[PDB]
Amino acid sequence: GIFNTRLSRTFGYTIKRTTVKTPSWAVDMMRFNINDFLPPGGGSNPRSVPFEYYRIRKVKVEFWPCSPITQGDRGVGSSAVILDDNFVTKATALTYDPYVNYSSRHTITQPFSYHSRYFTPKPVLDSTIDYFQPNNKRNQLWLRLQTAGNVDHVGLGTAFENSIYDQEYNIRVTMYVQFREFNLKDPPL
Amino acid sequence: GIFNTRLSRTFGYTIKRTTVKTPSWAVDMMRFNINDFLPPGGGSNPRSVPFEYYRIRKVKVEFWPCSPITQGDRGVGSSAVILDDNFVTKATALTYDPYVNYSSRHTITQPFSYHSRYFTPKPVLDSTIDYFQPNNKRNQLWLRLQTAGNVDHVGLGTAFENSIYDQEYNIRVTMYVQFREFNLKDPPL
Amino acid sequence: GIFNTRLSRTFGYTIKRTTVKTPSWAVDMMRFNINDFLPPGGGSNPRSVPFEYYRIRKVKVEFWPCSPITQGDRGVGSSAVILDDNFVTKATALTYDPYVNYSSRHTITQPFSYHSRYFTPKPVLDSTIDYFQPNNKRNQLWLRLQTAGNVDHVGLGTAFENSIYDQEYNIRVTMYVQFREFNLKDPPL
Amino acid sequence: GIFNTRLSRTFGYTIKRTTVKTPSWAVDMMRFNINDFLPPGGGSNPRSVPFEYYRIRKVKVEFWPCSPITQGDRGVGSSAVILDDNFVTKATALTYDPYVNYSSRHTITQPFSYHSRYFTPKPVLDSTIDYFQPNNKRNQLWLRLQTAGNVDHVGLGTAFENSIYDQEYNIRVTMYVQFREFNLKDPPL
Amino acid sequence: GIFNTRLSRTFGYTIKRTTVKTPSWAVDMMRFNINDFLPPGGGSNPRSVPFEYYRIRKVKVEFWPCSPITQGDRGVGSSAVILDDNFVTKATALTYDPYVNYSSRHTITQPFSYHSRYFTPKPVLDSTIDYFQPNNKRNQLWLRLQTAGNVDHVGLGTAFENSIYDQEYNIRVTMYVQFREFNLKDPPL
Amino acid sequence: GIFNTRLSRTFGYTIKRTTVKTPSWAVDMMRFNINDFLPPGGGSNPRSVPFEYYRIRKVKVEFWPCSPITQGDRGVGSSAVILDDNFVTKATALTYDPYVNYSSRHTITQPFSYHSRYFTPKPVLDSTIDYFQPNNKRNQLWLRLQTAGNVDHVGLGTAFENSIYDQEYNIRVTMYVQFREFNLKDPPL
Lengths: 189, 189, 189, 189, 189, 189
Fold this sequence. Notes:
The structure is cut from a larger assembly and holds six copies of chain A (189 residues).
Chain A: E1 3-15, E2 25-32, E3 40-42, E4 45-47, E5 51-65, E6 75-80, E7 91-94, E8 106-110, E9 115-119, E10 122-123, E11 143-144, E12 153-161, E13 167-182
Antiparallel strand pairs in A: 1-13, 2-7, 2-12, 3-4, 5-9, 5-11, 5-13, 6-8, 6-12, 10-12
Main location (chains A, B, C, D, E, F): host cell
Family (chains A, B, C, D, E, F): Belongs to the circoviridae capsid protein family.
Organism (chains A, B, C, D, E, F): Porcine circovirus 2
């Protein structure tokens, strides 16, 4: 019983100002979990979408700027796809862009420019070995939609060039999911 | 955002014994409401299936017998489709089968025989005028999936021939529904 | 060195009687392990079928009744396919059939009727995440035929309607397996 | 339930040295039994390959030398196929090669040369009459895989030319068999 | 960012002499890890090949002899492919060749003969269950190139026939690997 | 063993303000060396990319502005391709644009506009004679990837029109290189 749908979530991210003169970059990570998109249900149905299995097909991360088009001290960054839960260490002012030479690098124009990334994440099945599957719609694993313990999906790391002014963003993540085995429970009343 | 699924519900019905010698029939009615198939949800989602609109496409009423194949004093009844909420009055021992000459009559062999009816019900929009639509999948009205006040659908009346022995049945109603406009709400936690 | 064969096993299951008047259902689970079908071997060959690897292709669960065709208080249940080791909790008299709205539900006529289910199970690789593969004969994983520690396969849950009389069944599970790498060891004597 | 497989076995054979000056030959025989290739099983399965019937299709006898390529006093012998259990009498130093004029003679170069023979043996059904079947894959008799009393198959006799030095060989017999009627027994535990 | 290359490594293996008269075999195992082929890098690049992911496509094990062609007491052994990390126990003088009846057996002529094996190994993801994938270039899992903790690949076991003389070998393993996601890091200086 | 890849590097350039009223231009040069893109390696591998030879195919110089779109006193400049290491002398306020009549001149809109130049540089083999090759992918010379003494490539000179305000830029140079003869060294550990 397949049901392809779309789930979204919005949150903020700010790159604080720095008095540093050099071009330094601010590094951070981004994971994706389905608990943040799918709330708990009620009653005999533990989740709000009554299905048993799921598998995330795609994610769309949108960096919607919060800064005016008149803001100066512009910069240039990079967003890369990291499917293994080993990101570059979080840094405030690093002397280089680590994600620049990555094959999945897209340039981030800053601060007043929109940046989208559309990709297929991978689940963290074993963080010790960090193995994942290649892209195959027919062979992608089905995970279970747990009650409160779903596994973290992974796949984006960023590097933003710091500035004299604060750079704020409203980040909207949209997960395109595919469920299976409609499992609604209908007790009497 | 269409999602065709199937919802079921099971309950009992008994035709008590009678010392009456004549062939008399027991008349009863059967309505269908979605509250009995779809429970209330939890949180910001008032229902367990997160959709706004619905329309019932078909219903399958199954009279599963509870009586052995050795039971005597067998009989013959009738099930008809009544799409307007004006049934023959409920009777214990009526001297005739009212639903026998109906164009939608199917014979009910009793007591140890299975009887199915598969049809398209109609909602009770105005019980004073009792108007309904003909069968058209493209033009069928969409109703709202209310929280605790959904409208009764209608469409089956029965007439069972009484017997010296009690005739029990386990009735399984299956509604084939079609929802629209996925409306999940995901607050933080 | 492929060898497709067929292994069987027979055991009993009883649904005890209840004085409860309502229609209640008895819920139970069913797992499949190869230790119960393949005994230990002897000598340098740890198992009786001299192969290294295996993968279960199909299982046929047959509910052969033990009850006469004259037994009354008949009922109606459901059998569903559960490929993830999270079954509905075992219950003696539950007020509803949980497996009724499942997409893999087959109706169980009770008590004197035969019920078969033919499906492809999945192994329990990680019970925490509960991931499994879709059906693909060419890409199905090969497991190792361990000596005394094989992994449990999963895939059936049932719901039987209780009755005044005891409902007994002789359940015959047949696993259609596929082995690989003939590994017979022939020491002297 | 046919299962064609391959069973092997390795053992030694030595032609001891002789001070005799003349060219003399050492004669010996070679039978084949399935007890030497198939060990006893364990439990309710008396054999390690769980089948009832068998029939030997082919045998490959390989004389793998043990002697260096620098060894002198080389010689020339003969291997013939003897399907009736009446071999030339075993001799240490016979004044001629008895198997030389046989229609199934292959020359054995000695001592450091490989010799293979690939043929279809015959079972010893009656040693008094010594009757056997011609080669026909469709009409070949099925024998029973006994527990500890299988019948000897026959089909090779050799004649090695003696030498001043010892001539050792590691003989690897490979039987290509065909079983029938999978008969595994699975008691409880 | 795919880069198919070839990595090699050379090491020794000796089968010590034995006074035992019988034909006995020496059993041993062979695993493959990428730490032994890929050294650690320097600086911000933890490895010498600047890539993130890898997957081993093929391995070529070459037994290059160290013994002269005049060496006697020759023998015959077997090399088999064992993709599950459960080898025959290491033995000094075992009375039989365990790997002889394996479907992946290749004969090892000893002592002065070259033996190659070219196959696709499998990683040890779970040693408890010992599951692996079949050969599929498109669906083969990508592992992470860890810093100092890579997972052992597996796939060869051997059985060498002992001798009066020591049998030495120089074993050259060549792994044909496929990397992904060039991840060079270029800090200033 | 060819490997085409892409190496990047980012740095700043500022055109300081001037009280001069006339239109004057600021002249500067730009060379390219591979030491600034490829760091030193570690151990027996002197460089981080394990190859012997290289040849630079293309370079992309990107002038990413740092100034707001509201900045006035705009200007117009020129960027030209200079493949011989004899640039116009560096000047702070020159009374004309020297690179304006060059055949390889592209107009630089200032200050808030992006300027890219994509071309094929040439190495400085002899600065006394200053000879270079025409563009030919098949005949381009292979240089050696030295340890700490690589030769400077050349090919861009600029002329920016001065302003009352400071004009800052973040310059991102991307070199598209082609290596040869994979030369990884793997000592033991």
